[PDB]
Amino acid sequence: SEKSRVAIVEATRALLLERGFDGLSIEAVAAKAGVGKQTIYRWWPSRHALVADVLLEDADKILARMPKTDDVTADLASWAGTLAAALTTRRGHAMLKTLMAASLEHEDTAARLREGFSRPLIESVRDRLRDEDIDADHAQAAADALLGAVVNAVLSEGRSYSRQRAETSARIIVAGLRP
């Protein structure tokens, strides 16, 4: 109808902060919303799409922030470690996997999720480096490598990836920007 959609969105959101990601399939959502799964497909092509779409509604409060002190190495190491910690929690890791999964289903969905989740992280790192008069090309390349280190590692090896590897990758990258 017009409220059936809302019920699915609300069922998904409640199921998220109650059973987490592991117990959040289309069936659970459909049963909690009270609808046939094809009613869900009137609005989302897939479970990943539906979950990512709800998470996207919240990108702001999901994405955290860059320390800003007189020590750029400490700032980026702190940032990278906090990110690594966040994405290796059980919830954080399942979230990353869900967002990547949804992204790979449609190029438009990937673009939407990149704008929501990846862009603020790249821009935070890039801006912090430009603050120190690093040029645009090196700031971009360094940001690709620091965010890339963390995201790729968590996607590849999962929750055993550590705050410590992330921080070490950050210190190496920043040292390579000297002066």
Added chain:
Amino acid sequence: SEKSRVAIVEATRALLLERGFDGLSIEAVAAKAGVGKQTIYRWWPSRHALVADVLLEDADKILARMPKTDDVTADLASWAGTLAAALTTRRGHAMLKTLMAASLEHEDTAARLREGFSRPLIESVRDRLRDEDIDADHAQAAADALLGAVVNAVLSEGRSYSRQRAETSARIIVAGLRP
């Protein structure tokens, strides 16, 4: 039966080097093999799984190699640029997306594909750095960042990612390992 499986594997493999990835759905495979899609599910849970499984059969000839000169910066920049080039071709990019997609479906599948595709790349970079007496922790962190830069960027922004950004990320990382 026992040859129906072979026919699907052979249909997939031929369809790969004839129509590429964009024209390779379960339907095309089923029609070329002559089977019902549920016969395919006797052996693979999904289209991504089936495609990744065939690609995995070939990991060796898929994965390329590390230059070994007296210039570690040139070697890693060459390696990273070649990798970036390979993953931003139309076929290379669709392959990366398919492997990541399959990986996210089952933790065992991810582990199998990581062993097949990611491990040789990480180890190639790590080994090249240990060659220069970089310790194990920094060699790992630098490898995470160089491979991570490329893979994460191609997954996020697709085929517009360039050889040049990859090479710049490599030179920055290696410079951060001095001495």
